[PDB]
Design a protein around this motif. Structure first.
Motif, PDB file in Angstrom:
ATOM      1  N   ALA A   1       0.828  -1.198   0.000  1.00 17.45           N
ATOM      2  CA  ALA A   1       0.000   0.000   0.000  1.00 17.45           C
ATOM      3  C   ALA A   1       0.866   1.253   0.000  1.00 17.45           C
ATOM      4  O   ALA A   1       1.905   1.303   0.663  1.00 17.45           O
ATOM      5  N   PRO A   2       0.444   2.284  -0.744  1.00 16.15           N
ATOM      6  CA  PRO A   2       1.193   3.539  -0.821  1.00 16.15           C
ATOM      7  C   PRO A   2       1.042   4.384   0.435  1.00 16.15           C
ATOM      8  O   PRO A   2       0.036   4.305   1.133  1.00 16.15           O
ATOM      9  N   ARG A   3       2.063   5.181   0.721  1.00 16.83           N
ATOM     10  CA  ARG A   3       2.062   6.082   1.863  1.00 16.83           C
ATOM     11  C   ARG A   3       2.684   7.380   1.351  1.00 16.83           C
ATOM     12  O   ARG A   3       3.823   7.714   1.673  1.00 16.83           O
ATOM     13  N   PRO A   4       1.934   8.119   0.518  1.00 11.99           N
ATOM     14  CA  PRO A   4       2.422   9.379  -0.048  1.00 11.99           C
ATOM     15  C   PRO A   4       2.919  10.421   0.951  1.00 11.99           C
ATOM     16  O   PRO A   4       3.832  11.183   0.642  1.00 11.99           O
TER      17      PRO A   4
ATOM     18  N   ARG B   1       6.889   6.440   0.420  1.00 13.81           N
ATOM     19  CA  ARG B   1       7.226   5.027   0.542  1.00 13.81           C
ATOM     20  C   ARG B   1       5.999   4.149   0.346  1.00 13.81           C
ATOM     21  O   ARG B   1       4.866   4.633   0.318  1.00 13.81           O
ATOM     22  N   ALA B   2       6.243   2.849   0.214  1.00 12.83           N
ATOM     23  CA  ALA B   2       5.175   1.868   0.088  1.00 12.83           C
ATOM     24  C   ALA B   2       5.384   0.940   1.279  1.00 12.83           C
ATOM     25  O   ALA B   2       6.522   0.656   1.662  1.00 12.83           O
TER      26      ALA B   2
ATOM     27  N   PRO C   1       6.990  -0.003   9.623  1.00 13.99           N
ATOM     28  CA  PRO C   1       6.973   1.447   9.816  1.00 13.99           C
ATOM     29  C   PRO C   1       7.959   2.141   8.885  1.00 13.99           C
ATOM     30  O   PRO C   1       8.839   1.502   8.318  1.00 13.99           O
ATOM     31  N   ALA C   2       7.801   3.450   8.723  1.00 10.98           N
ATOM     32  CA  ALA C   2       8.725   4.216   7.905  1.00 10.98           C
ATOM     33  C   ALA C   2      10.064   4.083   8.636  1.00 10.98           C
ATOM     34  O   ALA C   2      10.089   3.893   9.847  1.00 10.98           O
ATOM     35  N   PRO C   3      11.192   4.205   7.919  1.00  8.56           N
ATOM     36  CA  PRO C   3      11.269   4.462   6.483  1.00  8.56           C
ATOM     37  C   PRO C   3      11.374   3.243   5.570  1.00  8.56           C
ATOM     38  O   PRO C   3      11.801   3.381   4.425  1.00  8.56           O
ATOM     39  N   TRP C   4      11.002   2.056   6.053  1.00 13.22           N
ATOM     40  CA  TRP C   4      11.055   0.874   5.190  1.00 13.22           C
ATOM     41  C   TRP C   4      10.184   1.170   3.967  1.00 13.22           C
ATOM     42  O   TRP C   4       9.054   1.650   4.096  1.00 13.22           O
ATOM     43  N   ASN C   5      10.710   0.874   2.783  1.00 17.90           N
ATOM     44  CA  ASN C   5      10.016   1.174   1.532  1.00 17.90           C
ATOM     45  C   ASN C   5       9.927  -0.083   0.677  1.00 17.90           C
ATOM     46  O   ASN C   5      10.923  -0.506   0.093  1.00 17.90           O
ATOM     47  N   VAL C   6       8.735  -0.671   0.598  1.00 18.38           N
ATOM     48  CA  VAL C   6       8.553  -1.904  -0.162  1.00 18.38           C
ATOM     49  C   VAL C   6       8.422  -1.699  -1.668  1.00 18.38           C
ATOM     50  O   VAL C   6       7.322  -1.584  -2.206  1.00 18.38           O
ATOM     51  N   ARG C   7       9.569  -1.668  -2.336  1.00 19.40           N
ATOM     52  CA  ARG C   7       9.634  -1.490  -3.779  1.00 19.40           C
ATOM     53  C   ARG C   7      11.074  -1.744  -4.200  1.00 19.40           C
ATOM     54  O   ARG C   7      11.995  -1.590  -3.393  1.00 19.40           O
TER      55      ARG C   7
ATOM     56  N   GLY D   1       8.684  -8.276  20.435  1.00 17.15           N
ATOM     57  CA  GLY D   1       9.323  -6.994  20.202  1.00 17.15           C
ATOM     58  C   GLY D   1       8.831  -6.395  18.895  1.00 17.15           C
ATOM     59  O   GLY D   1       8.871  -5.179  18.705  1.00 17.15           O
ATOM     60  N   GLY D   2       8.371  -7.255  17.990  1.00 19.49           N
ATOM     61  CA  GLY D   2       7.859  -6.779  16.717  1.00 19.49           C
ATOM     62  C   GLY D   2       8.766  -6.987  15.517  1.00 19.49           C
ATOM     63  O   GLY D   2       9.870  -7.524  15.631  1.00 19.49           O
ATOM     64  N   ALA D   3       8.286  -6.546  14.358  1.00 21.40           N
ATOM     65  CA  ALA D   3       9.022  -6.673  13.110  1.00 21.40           C
ATOM     66  C   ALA D   3      10.386  -5.990  13.155  1.00 21.40           C
ATOM     67  O   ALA D   3      10.489  -4.795  13.430  1.00 21.40           O
TER      68      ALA D   3
END
Length: 661
Positions: free
Chosen positions: A39-42, A47-48, A64-70, A112-114
């Motif tokens: 999903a996009p996060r303009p 980032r996606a 969470p940001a700043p991970w960008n799936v692309r 602890g999470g991702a």
């Protein structure tokens, strides 16, 4: 309701809203009883992210940001993630982070999470290392995918192959720990697809100067016990048969979408001989142009049925029974389904939209035939009365050829225009050019229509969704067919008395930008135009001026340089830049690897002093296509200002764009 000049109507849809709601769910995929998608996060640096939808309906971003799936595979981004359910510890997922192009692994349910951990090494040679279209194989402790490894500094100094990456992270800083499953004999390849018994793998492959929609070969190899590929060979396909997708059904059969009949249709394939058998012959597309590895239009279900996004023009998800040839489509309001699909149990999950609702994640159950929204549920940002009512129309050109288009007349529940006036219309040329634009809710379109400006979206010759012939109409004709088809729709609307002949604008990005620029240069139909990250310099583009995937696309579009060198100069907008006699706006991303900003610089230099009012806005931190909210807001308001100024209509709420000769 009140009367007001077309283009001056007050609209609740502002550019910030458009930017905020831009994009759509993409690359959907089932993971156990969960459904994930990108999903996009303009507003988050463009980032996606990955969205995780649980069986009970829980739906949240998993990174969470700043991970960008692309990723930058084919510079358009191949399927960027994969996931598998596990008996304990929650699911295991992998994704490509855009920032470093590395493949990362993470466990959302870890205490602890991702916490993403890198799996791949990096390179300082050319574009480095890129990965996409992964398949998780926990039994082997690896993730298999396709890879790009630059071997030089040129855009085409790159080798591609199928690879195996260890899930334990042992290759994070060790390139030798990455196993090369296939060789690099083919320049372009997609990810591997393994048979149920894990003994056979297939993948698509092709080379210059072909685009995959011209032709591809389905490669196959026996998977050895220790995870190697043996006896690689071409199962079927060729330079003129476009195999767009290949999948193994749970029963071990092999299914592919090929256009050998003139339309992409599903065929069962003998895994040994390669012989193909039609499963549903129809004058409808069951696949599309393969712009990136991992696209899916169909998906075999465990119960033997096959979920398929299909249709002539608009594509909708349906369920095919390969034994009876019977096909039952989803109902609901959705009229267009995107090229992404996944299955789980008796359910098929896709992404669809309608003229009244943005793309949502939709589930179709084969047991009941019921379709329902399960993710990204659409809520109206403004009264739906402000959305245009699309008219799917086919125009007849001078020689009788059909030109498919989507017409969006001005529309507002609060205004109507002067009885003695007609609305200006913005004619849009989609990118690609080998693609198609759907007729669904698009706030970018509503942005104009709600203000009193009509829109005409043209699926000109060369567009997909209407058969190989229609797609092939553009071969060698780029700059002519796209230009004339769009102009034919434009003048038709004017002649019919629904659009103001003196107030027609042309606009488009990428291939559409070339069409827009070409239209302003080769015709005098438009009053102005908006050009986004276009192709304007053919000689430059062909001379190492674009990414590898499209480095020979011109062979298809205008003919080989060997056979038609003259067209490379004659058809370039740059060559006749001085013929532009109306105002225009050029928009460009400075990090664009598909259409380098140099394209614009040279064009601007060629128009300098011609006395033509124009403006140029480039954006740092943006590649091909704008992803940051702030960028889109500025780009859209600038386009509207150009139209306001040219069409002679006061449009406040939007900064006045400085047009200079």
């Amino acid at each position: 309701v009140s009367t007001a000049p077309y283009g001056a109507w007050q609209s609740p849809i502002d550019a910030a809203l458009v930017a905020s709601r831009s994009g759509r769910p993409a690359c959907v995929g089932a993971v156990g009883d969960e459904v994930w998608w990108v999903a996009p996060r303009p507003a988050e640096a463009g980032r996606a992210t990955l969205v995780r939808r649980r069986a009970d309906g829980a739906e949240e971003s998993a990174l969470p940001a700043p991970w960008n799936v692309r990723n930058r595979v084919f510079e358009y981004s191949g399927f960027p993630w994969a996931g598998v359910p596990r008996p304990a510890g929650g699911p295991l997922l992998v994704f490509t982070h855009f920032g470093d192009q590395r493949l990362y692994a993470f466990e959302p349910d870890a205490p602890g999470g991702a916490v993403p951990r890198p799996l791949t090494p990096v390179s300082a040679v050319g574009g480095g290392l890129r990965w996409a279209d992964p398949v998780l194989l926990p039994e082997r402790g690896e993730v298999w995918c396709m890879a790009e490894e630059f071997t030089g500094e040129g855009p085409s100094d790159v080798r591609r192959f199928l690879a195996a990456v260890p899930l334990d992270g042992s290759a994070a800083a060790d390139r030798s720990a990455v196993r090369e499953l296939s060789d690099d004999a083919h320049r372009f390849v997609t990810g591997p697809r393994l048979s149920p018994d894990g003994r056979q793998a297939v993948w698509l492959a092709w080379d210059h100067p072909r685009m995959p929609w011209e032709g591809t070969e389905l490669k196959t190899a026996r998977v050895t016990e220790d995870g190697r590929f043996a006896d690689t060979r071409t199962l079927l396909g060729g330079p003129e048969e476009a195999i767009a997708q290949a999948e193994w059904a749970p029963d071990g059969s092999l299914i592919v979408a090929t256009d050998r009949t003139g339309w992409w249709n599903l065929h069962r394939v003998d895994p040994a001989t390669g012989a193909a058998t039609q499963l549903c012959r129809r004058e409808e597309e069951f696949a599309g142009p393969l712009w990136t590895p991992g696209m899916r239009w169909f998906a075999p279900l465990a119960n033997g049925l096959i979920a398929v996004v299909h249709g002539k023009g608009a594509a909708v998800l349906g369920i095919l029974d390969p034994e009876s040839g019977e096909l039952v489509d989803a109902a609901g309001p959705w009229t267009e389904w995107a090229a992404t699909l996944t299955v789980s149990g008796t359910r098929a999950v896709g992404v669809a939209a309608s003229p009244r609702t943005a793309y949502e994640v939709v589930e179709l159950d084969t047991v009941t035939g019921r379709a329902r929204t399960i993710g990204a549920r659409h809520t109206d940002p403004v009264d739906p009365a402000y959305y245009p009512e699309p008219q799917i129309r086919t125009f007849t050109a001078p020689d009788g050829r059909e030109i498919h288009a989507h017409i969006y007349p001005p529309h507002s529940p609060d205004f109507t225009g002067p009885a003695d006036e007609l609305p200006p219309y913005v004619v849009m040329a989609h990118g690609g050019p080998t693609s198609r634009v759907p007729a669904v809710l698009d706030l970018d379109v509503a942005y104009f229509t709600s203000r009193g400006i009509g829109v005409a979206d043209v699926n000109y010759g060369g567009s997909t969704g209407y058969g190989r012939a229609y797609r092939e109409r553009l071969r060698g004709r780029w700059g002519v067919v796209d230009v004339e088809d769009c102009a034919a729709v434009a003048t038709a609307l004017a002649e019919e008395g629904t659009a103001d002949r003196a107030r027609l604008a042309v606009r488009g990005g990428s291939a559409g930008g070339w069409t827009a620029a070409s239209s302003l240069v080769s015709t005098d139909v438009y009053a102005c135009g908006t050009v986004l990250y276009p192709v304007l310099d053919l000689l430059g583009w062909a001379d190492g001026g674009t990414h590898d995937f499209e480095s020979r696309y011109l062979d298809f579009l205008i003919g080989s340089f060997e056979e038609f060198p003259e067209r490379y100069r004659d058809r370039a907008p740059l060559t006749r830049a001085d013929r532009v006699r109306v105002p225009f706006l050029l928009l460009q991303g400075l990090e664009d690897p598909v259409c380098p900003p140099e394209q614009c610089d040279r064009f601007l230099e060629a128009v300098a002093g011609c006395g033509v009012p124009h403006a140029y806005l480039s954006f740092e931190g943006e590649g091909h296509g704008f992803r940051r909210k702030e960028t889109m807001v500025r780009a859209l308001e600038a386009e509207l200002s150009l139209y306001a100024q040219v069409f002679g209509v006061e449009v406040a709420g939007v900064p006045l764009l400085k047009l200079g000769e």
